[PDB]
Write a protein that binds this ligand. Structure first.
Ligand code: ZN
Ligand code: ZN
Lengths: 612, 259, 258, 75
């Protein structure tokens, strides 16, 4: 009974090979002690030795009293946890479920032994959790990924395997239906199971079970820390049904219950930005700010929410200030997201993004990379944002390095002189890793942001056709539900904006207007979309509605953009209202004084034609 | 003018002496107005209560930022000294702890990780004031920075213990695994401090002799134990020592901030 | 002076009258009358006021002397005590001291500048320190600009006035919206209660001997009481617009009614 | 034509954020973010502390912190 204590005090000293040797020796001494089997399997799995842990599980004699079946089911679920990375993975969970259901003997024990009420119902929630995990395993995990390393050019059998996998995952989904209904039947207090069932209902492309179950989440998920996951799906469903007011009200009263729910606050904010009702979030932000006890430093969630609100109003300076205040302490759940937001702001400061055609640029990308070095090296976001920072420089060799970085990203997804020294070293590292194009064309589009980055790299470097191909491949997934999402992720919307930009260079504008109307119906605060529709109106000489939407854009921007201000002033000049043009240009200069061509093209003619 | 008010009740004494001052102090504290009670006690001639109140203010300020707690704690220590002029040096504990909470970090800001490590090991002496998670995270940080993995493992073990404790979702486990997959838990820490009596070599962060059990004093700025007074600067206000080779850039004592 | 909606294209003053008229861009012509508001201080016989919105005219009344201080910037608040004057400008606070030369002609010298943008509802100069007061907080600063003390009251402060004292220990007099009239010694951090009124105190002055107190409430009702352990009321008179105590005679009050 | 807005420098956002330098070396291999949630936001300087002035500064700062929220009038 002290061999496990020796093993634990031995792994406390952080000797891991020695722990493996000692536990294997104590296992050979007595292979009927299950605790050391579990500890050895856990340790081997944690160190990346999956095969050795599986050998430890299989070699157990167990793989009838209550304890024996308890160790049986614990071994089964531990085997599943080790094999969390197909059919093979789910089999252990299924067998654990079957043995747990047989564990009949529990009923025969408890219904007559008159045990404690706590210990009678304790072995029910466990079974419900097993069922819930099986259902989530079937929903999320995909037996899809093949090697597809070039391989012989096959006529049919690859397609046969593909459709067999499709039938397999459909069977997994319909079996997960049974697993989840069993889970919710065995325990109604499992908020997680209700969430999984709602997600499954939304998943199956149904128009009836959706409103049957994944609308009832207010009754299902009453209150917990995972209510944000319910709220995002509920909001996306409501926006699909154009039931915007209900989506508002559920956020209203859920935040009335919890003023400090920063993730739900973010969803509320992005919803309002989509609806164009941005100032309506000010009272919610004030309630969150006053929800602090006596004052004190703003919590990182609160600071991130404030920075997001400022950024959505094109108040990028206060956005950067609040985002920088969000990363403290580092390693918080927002610190990665705050860093990503800061890098995005330094990358695209205005509404104009990287896909448009320089000491300020060098300083901006310098600060961007200085922040980027704060990100974990193994994180995917750092790996794609490194390519983004490199492609920001517009240097063709940096474009090549970014292109190769993005190709590496998609391939991996398919399967104070010291600071300057670090900057230079990471630049050299990107250069040497840059020293696969058909992989982008043929592989599954699983990582959308890497696809967008690759597409804009192709466009900036000059190849418009390949950018068209890769972005069409990215957006053939959803083309819509994706835009109607109330999510922080906006890569799809940015893809729509890029498609509008590319179509504006093709001589055609009807499809660009189609895309713009789609995104603006989804998102009323898309100032760049208003700008582009105003511009194509200016091509169509429809100047009144162009000025109207430009005023919309100017209101959303809060009079802090040089390009929409420039075109608004030019429209006022063509409209013969030089006072308004002078006002717009004075706002442009009091915010961005270094913008060229503003005075010499608008202010001079406004002064000249003020009193004709 | 409560000090002279209480001192005035001397001839023949009086049926009542003070005791309204305590009532007003209770009113001030219950009203949550903090510093007014401190000023009332300081004028009352009772610096111990003012020191206690400043200690409370330091405790409350600690959760937001360490510098404010440091300020309040050195203020309370100064009030205790005023009372003595009007366990002995325990009034300075809350100072030095938070002082280390900055000082170590300052040495990390200068890329001087060795003295930072010694200060981090000195942080253990005040586990009651500073959170053990805070101090041992600093210890593991400093030990990892100098590539000494023995103290790094000894701190990571306590971090993992606390992380398993608060559950009764683990980044300490990931960090320990990633740091001990490649680097062995070797303890590369030399002993370069001789006891004045025994002469045996102790570790730099020793609070006492390893065998003779004679107390040691630590460097304020570098953290290493002091054994020779030939190079031991002292501050007359806080009665704390420092080493000349590292304190020559300090116009004022880094603990109590007096030139 | 006034704000319009669009650009104000023109604005001209009516000749020889405190009135101007402006025409805007949205086809609106509007005429504004102007009533001059005067800030003023008086200590003993010294009386200072603002002329031309930028100059300080100081006038010794019983001796009939007068001089002009060209502050060159808009003057917001003025305070006067003994030979000391405080002028709150738009970005600074300037403390002047008055003195006499060999020819017995009074002169002014600027002895202190405080380059702190101060926001307060009341200002009071003293021998060595200035005091500003806003809402609940009363902050006392030295002539360089470093803070010296601060008091937090129970109610917003309506009146604040230095009533004189020893150098560095000068008394203040504060009236609060709760009806509290209290003495704020600049060395003490604890105000001493004098009067507990039932209405906000708009004005209050202390006797020359400081053993009697005059309080003007929010209802323009004046009460004069004998100070002590309990303020025994001496008399009360209604519809009082202002009050003053005799600097040289103890029991001599002069109050102007509505 | 291309125009990039002038955004504040990283050291302008925080004066005592020198950890930005330090954290940029250790992260050369992997992430140690659970150890870096302990660094203080500010840093101590080389100054002298007068007791009464320091207490007055602390009281004034706490009063200003209260009044910053009290300016909105919410209760
Ligand atoms: Zn010894
Ligand atoms: Zn000292």
């Amino acid at each position: 009974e002290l061999s496990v204590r020796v093993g634990r005090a031995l792994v406390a000293a952080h000797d891991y090979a020695k722990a493996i040797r000692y536990y294997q020796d104590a296992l050979v001494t007595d292979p009927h002690l299950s605790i050391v089997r579990a500890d050895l399997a856990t340790l081997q799995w944690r160190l990346g030795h999956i095969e050795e842990a599986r050998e430890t599980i299989v070699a157990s004699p167990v793989y009838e009293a209550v304890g024996t079946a308890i160790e049986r089911i614990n071994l089964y679920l531990l085997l599943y946890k080790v094999l969390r990375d197909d059919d093979n993975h789910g089999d252990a969970a299924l067998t654990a479920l079957l043995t747990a259901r047989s564990l009949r003997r529990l009923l025969e024990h408890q219904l007559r032994t008159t045990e404690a009420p706590e210990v009678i119902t304790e072995q029910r929630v466990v079974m419900s959790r097993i069922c819930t995990e099986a259902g989530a395993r079937c929903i999320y995990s995909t037996p899809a990924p093949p090697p597809f390393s070039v391989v012989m050019t096959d006529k049919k059998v690859e397609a046969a395997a593909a459709l067999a996998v499709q039938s397999a995952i459909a069977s997994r989904l319909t079996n997960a239906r049974e697993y989840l209904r069993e889970a919710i039947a065995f325990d109604e207090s499992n908020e997680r199971a209700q969430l999984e069932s709602a997600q499954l209902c939304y998943r199956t492309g149904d128009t009836e079970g959706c409103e049957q179950h994944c609308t009832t989440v207010l009754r299902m998920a009453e209150g917990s820390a995972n209510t944000a996951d319910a709220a995002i799906l509920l909001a996306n469903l409501y926006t699909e049904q154009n039931r915007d007011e209900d989506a508002r009200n559920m956020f209203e009263d859920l935040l009335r219950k919890t003023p400090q729910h920063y993730e739900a606050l973010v969803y509320y904010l992005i919803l309002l930005y989509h609806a164009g009702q941005l100032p309506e979030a000010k009272e919610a932000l004030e309630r969150a700010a006053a929800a602090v006890p006596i004052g004190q430093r703003a919590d990182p969630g609160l600071s991130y929410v404030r920075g997001l609100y400022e950024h959505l109003c094109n108040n990028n300076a206060e956005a950067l200030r609040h985002f920088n205040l969000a990363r403290l302490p580092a390693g918080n759940p927002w610190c990665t997201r705050a860093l990503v937001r800061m890098i995005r702001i330094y990358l695209v400061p205005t509404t104009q993004d990287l896909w448009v055609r320089s000491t300020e640029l060098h300083d901006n990308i310098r600060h961007a990379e200085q922040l980027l070095l704060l990100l974990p090296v193994h994180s995917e976001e750092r790996r794609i944002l490194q390519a983004y920072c490199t492609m920001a420089t517009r240097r063709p060799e940096e474009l090549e390095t970014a292109l190769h970085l993005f190709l590496e990203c998609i391939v991996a997804a398919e399967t104070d002189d010291e600071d300057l020294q670090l900057l230079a070293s990471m630049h050299e590292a990107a250069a040497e890793l840059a020293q696969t194009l058909a992989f982008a064309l043929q592989c599954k589009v699983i990582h959308p942001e890497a696809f967008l980055g690759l597409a804009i790299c192709l466009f900036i470097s000059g190849q418009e056709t390949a950018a068209r191909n890769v972005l069409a491949r990215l957006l053939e997934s959803k083309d819509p539900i994706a835009i109607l999402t109330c999510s922080e992720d906006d890569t799809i919307e940015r893809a729509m904006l890029f498609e509008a930009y590319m179509d504006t260079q093709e001589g055609r504008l009807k499809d660009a207007r189609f895309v713009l109307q789609q995104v603006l119906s989804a998102n009323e605060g898309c100032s760049s979309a208003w700008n582009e529709l105003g511009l194509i109106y200016e091509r169509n000489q429809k100047h009144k509605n162009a000025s109207q939407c430009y005023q919309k854009a100017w209101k959303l921007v809060q009079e802090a953009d040089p390009d929409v201000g420039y075109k608004l002033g030019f429209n006022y000049l063509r409209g013969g209202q030089p006072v308004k043009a002078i006002d717009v240009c004075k706002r442009v200069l009091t915010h961005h004084a270094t913008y060229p061509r503003i005075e010499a093209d608008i202010m001079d003619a406004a002064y000249s034609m003020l009193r004709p | 003018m409560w000090n002279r008010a209480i001192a005035l009740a001397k001839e023949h004494r009086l049926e009542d002496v003070g005791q309204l001052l305590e009532k007003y102090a209770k009113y001030l504290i219950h009203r949550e107005r903090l510093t007014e009670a401190i000023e009332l006690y300081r004028k009352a001639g009772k610096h111990d209560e003012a020191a206690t109140l400043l200690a409370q203010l330091g405790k409350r300020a600690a959760l937001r930022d360490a510098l404010k707690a440091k300020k309040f704690y050195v203020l309370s220590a100064l009030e205790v000294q005023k009372y003595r002029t009007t366990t002995l040096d325990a009034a300075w504990r809350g100072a030095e702890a938070y002082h280390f909470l900055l000082m170590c970090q300052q040495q990390m800001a200068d890329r001087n990780f060795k003295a930072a490590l010694v200060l981090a090991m000195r942080l253990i002496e005040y586990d009651d004031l500073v959170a053990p998670v805070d101090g041992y995270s600093l210890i593991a940080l400093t030990a990892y920075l100098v590539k000494n993995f023995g103290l790094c493992s000894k701190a990571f073990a306590r971090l993992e213990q606390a992380e398993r404790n608060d559950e009764a979702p683990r980044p300490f486990a990931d960090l320990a695994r990633h740091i001990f997959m490649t680097h062995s838990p070797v303890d590369t820490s030399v002993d370069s401090v001789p006891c004045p009596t025994c002469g045996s070599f102790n570790k730099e962060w020793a609070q006492r002799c390893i065998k003779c059990q004679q107390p040691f004093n630590t460097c304020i700025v570098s953290g290493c134990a002091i054994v020779s007074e030939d190079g031991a600067w002292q501050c007359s206000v806080c009665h704390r020592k420092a080493l000349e080779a590292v304190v020559d850039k300090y116009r004022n004592c880094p603990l109590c901030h007096t030139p | 002076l006034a704000s319009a909606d669009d650009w104000i294209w023109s604005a001209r003053q009516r000749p020889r009258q405190k009135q101007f008229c402006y025409g805007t861009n949205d086809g609106t012509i509007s005429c504004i009358d102007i009533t001059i508001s005067t800030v003023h201080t008086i200590y003993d016989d010294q009386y200072v006021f603002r002329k031309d919105m930028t100059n300080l005219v100081v006038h010794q009344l019983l001796v009939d002397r007068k001089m002009v201080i060209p502050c060159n910037e808009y003057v917001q608040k003025i305070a006067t005590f003994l030979d000391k004057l405080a002028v709150q400008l738009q970005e600074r606070v300037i403390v002047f001291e008055f003195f006499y030369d060999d020819d017995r002609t009074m002169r002014y010298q600027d002895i202190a500048q405080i380059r702190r943008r101060l926001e307060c509802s009341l200002l009071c100069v003293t021998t060595g320190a200035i005091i500003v007061s806003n809402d609940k907080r009363i902050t006392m600063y030295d002539f360089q600009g470093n803070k010296r003390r601060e008091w937090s009251m129970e109610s917003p402060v309506q009146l604040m006035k230095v009533v004189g004292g020893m150098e560095g220990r000068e008394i203040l007099l504060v009236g609060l919206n709760g009806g509290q009239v209290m003495k704020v010694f600049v060395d003490n951090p604890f105000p001493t209660l004098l009067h507990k009124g039932t209405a906000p105190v708009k004005s209050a002055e202390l006797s020359s001997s400081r053993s009697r107190l005059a309080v003007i409430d929010s209802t323009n009702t004046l009460q004069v009481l004998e100070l002590g352990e309990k303020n025994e009321l001496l008399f009360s008179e209604d519809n009082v617009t202002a009050v003053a105590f005799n600097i040289d005679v103890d029991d001599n009050i002069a109050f102007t009614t509505g | 034509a291309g125009f990039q807005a002038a955004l504040p420098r990283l050291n302008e956002l925080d004066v005592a954020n020198s950890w930005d330098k330090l954290l940029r070396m250790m992260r050369s291999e992997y992430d140690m973010s659970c150890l870096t949630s302990c660094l203080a936001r500010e840093l101590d300087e080389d100054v002298a502390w007068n007791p009464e002035m320091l207490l007055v500064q602390l009281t004034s700062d706490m009063l200003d912190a209260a009044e910053l929220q009290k300016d909105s009038g919410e209760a």
